[PDB]
Amino acid sequence: NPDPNANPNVDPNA
Amino acid sequence: QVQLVQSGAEVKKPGASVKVSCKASGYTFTSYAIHWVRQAPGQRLEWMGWIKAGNGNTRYSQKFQDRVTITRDTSASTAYMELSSLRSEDTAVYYCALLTVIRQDDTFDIWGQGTMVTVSSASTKGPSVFPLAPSSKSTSGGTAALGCLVKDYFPEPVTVSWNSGALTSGVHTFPAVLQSSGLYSLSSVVTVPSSSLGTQTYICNVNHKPSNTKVDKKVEP
Amino acid sequence: DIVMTQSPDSLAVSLGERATINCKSSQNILYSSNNKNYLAWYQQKPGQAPKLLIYWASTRESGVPDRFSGSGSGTDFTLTISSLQAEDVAVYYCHQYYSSPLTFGGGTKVEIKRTVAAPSVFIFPPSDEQLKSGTASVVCLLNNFYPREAKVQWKVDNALQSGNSQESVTEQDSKDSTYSLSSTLTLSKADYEKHKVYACEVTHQGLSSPVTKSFNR
Numbered sequence A: 001n002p003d004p005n006a007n008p009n010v011d012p013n014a
Numbered sequence B: 001q002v003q004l005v006q007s008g009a010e011v012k013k014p015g016a017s018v019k020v021s022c023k024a025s026g027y028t029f030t031s032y033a034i035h036w037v038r039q040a041p042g043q044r045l046e047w048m049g050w051i052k053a054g055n056g057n058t059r060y061s062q063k064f065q066d067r068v069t070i071t072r073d074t075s076a077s078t079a080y081m082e083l084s085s086l087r088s089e090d091t092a093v094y095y096c097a098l099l100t101v102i103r104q105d106d107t108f109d110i111w112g113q114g115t116m117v118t119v120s121s122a123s124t125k126g127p128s129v130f131p132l133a134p135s136s137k138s139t140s141g142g143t144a145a146l147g148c149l150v151k152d153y154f155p156e157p158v159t160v161s162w163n164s165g166a167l168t169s170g171v172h173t174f175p176a177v178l179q180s181s182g183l184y185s186l187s188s189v190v191t192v193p194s195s196s197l198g199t200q201t202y203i204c205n206v207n208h209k210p211s212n213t214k215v216d217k218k219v220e221p
Numbered sequence C: 001d002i003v004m005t006q007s008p009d010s011l012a013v014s015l016g017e018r019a020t021i022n023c024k025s026s027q028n029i030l031y032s033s034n035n036k037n038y039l040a041w042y043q044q045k046p047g048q049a050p051k052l053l054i055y056w057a058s059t060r061e062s063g064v065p066d067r068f069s070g071s072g073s074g075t076d077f078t079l080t081i082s083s084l085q086a087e088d089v090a091v092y093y094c095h096q097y098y099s100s101p102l103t104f105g106g107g108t109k110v111e112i113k114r115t116v117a118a119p120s121v122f123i124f125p126p127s128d129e130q131l132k133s134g135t136a137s138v139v140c141l142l143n144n145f146y147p148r149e150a151k152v153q154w155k156v157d158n159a160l161q162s163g164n165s166q167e168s169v170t171e172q173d174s175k176d177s178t179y180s181l182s183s184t185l186t187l188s189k190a191d192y193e194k195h196k197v198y199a200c201e202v203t204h205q206g207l208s209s210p211v212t213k214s215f216n217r
Helices: C128-132 C189-193
Strands: B003-006 B010-012 B018-025 B033-039 B045-052 B058-060 B068-073 B078-083 B092-101 B108-111 B115-119 B128-132 B143-153 B159-162 B171-173 B184-193 B203-208 B213-218 C004-007 C010-014 C019-025 C039-044 C051-055 C068-073 C076-081 C090-096 C108-113 C120-124 C135-145 C151-156 C165-169 C179-188 C197-203 C211-216
Touching: B003 B092, B003 B108, B010 B018, B018 B033, B018 B092, B018 B115, B033 B068, B033 B078, B045 B068, B045 B078, B058 B068, B078 B092, B108 C051, B128 B213, B128 C128, B128 C135, B143 B203, B143 C120, B143 C135, B159 B184, B184 C135, B184 C165, B184 C179, C004 C090, C010 C019, C019 C090, C019 C108, C039 C068, C051 C068, C076 C090, C120 C197, C120 C211, C128 C135, C135 C151, C135 C189, C135 C197, C151 C165, C151 C179, C179 C189, C179 C197
Parallel strands: B010 B115, C010 C108
Antiparallel strands: B003 B018, B018 B078, B033 B045, B033 B092, B045 B058, B068 B078, B092 B108, B092 B115, B128 B143, B143 B184, B159 B203, B171 B184, B203 B213, C004 C019, C019 C076, C039 C051, C039 C090, C068 C076, C090 C108, C120 C135, C135 C179, C151 C197, C165 C179, C197 C211
């Protein structure tokens, strides 16, 4: 799974 | 018009510390995460860490996690990066960036202009500017060269414009070279019609911010 | 830690032909839960900060020309520039944001192949001003030429100089794709005034015979 705190600026759903 | 604006170039001694500011304007400062990315001479982009500008919370790369400190001041819309126990390998350009702000409401990506940090015991020195004078005489080709030699400065960089930014076409500002003496030197040239010489006015604007030297030199044939 | 490996490290194509840049992640960066590959492409032109072109491996950033397209999936990705413009000269990076730490590739320097162009040669004597301070800097300029390789030889009263000069060449021009070169010869004032004829001799692919620019002190 992606680490969603790799870059907090990324919203993975859009 | 979303802008990130970093503090000027610095020279710091081995083992010392450096602090680089990153002023972020044009958007809600607490909304996004500001990252710090550096790039060594001839080397790749290297992520160092981010800070959530609202939270104040951080993540640092493992490589830097015992040496780097990222802070923010919301009232001053400013992020800061501090790097301790400097080594010459840390000589680099440091950037702040709003990296990949991905949203359905616009995806954007915005970098600072970058900050040159030189790790060196050597002193700070302002450059001398000398004219690179053209010939007013009329040739079978019709074009003259002119310029300014920007000589004996440390650390990098220097910035050069012509006529307060009015003259960009034809301009060549060369990468500085490190002289045997330890000081940098570069030249900035431009090619113009020979007719413009006696009439048009040419001034190189030289700014070396680590020594707060600012020189304007009118170059005459 | 995901490492990013790009190939080739530099390529040179003539204007209007495609530039193909490849990038591999050491691990998968496809998220099967949302079917998105966590890859990005940046173009970084000399003196400037990187600029985003592509995200989610294949979505174009607002404002990016259509000749820029990204493809691939999982662990193999490619930046394709369908018709290389003069101004596309830069180093290009791929970038993963699947896992922390965020990492970039090593860069692909993308440069234009074009026809030969001889340089324009100019020689600058040192200013009187500088000579007050006891040093002499003689500058030879080669302007907007191609290919990049050039030979500058300083001759002083027709004696070939060695060890006493420094060169620097600009990046490739974003309009006509040429290069310009500086050669600076530095002498003490005493070594300057003991000679008369100062000359740089330029050899280059564009000059069937080398070009000598000269002055008398």
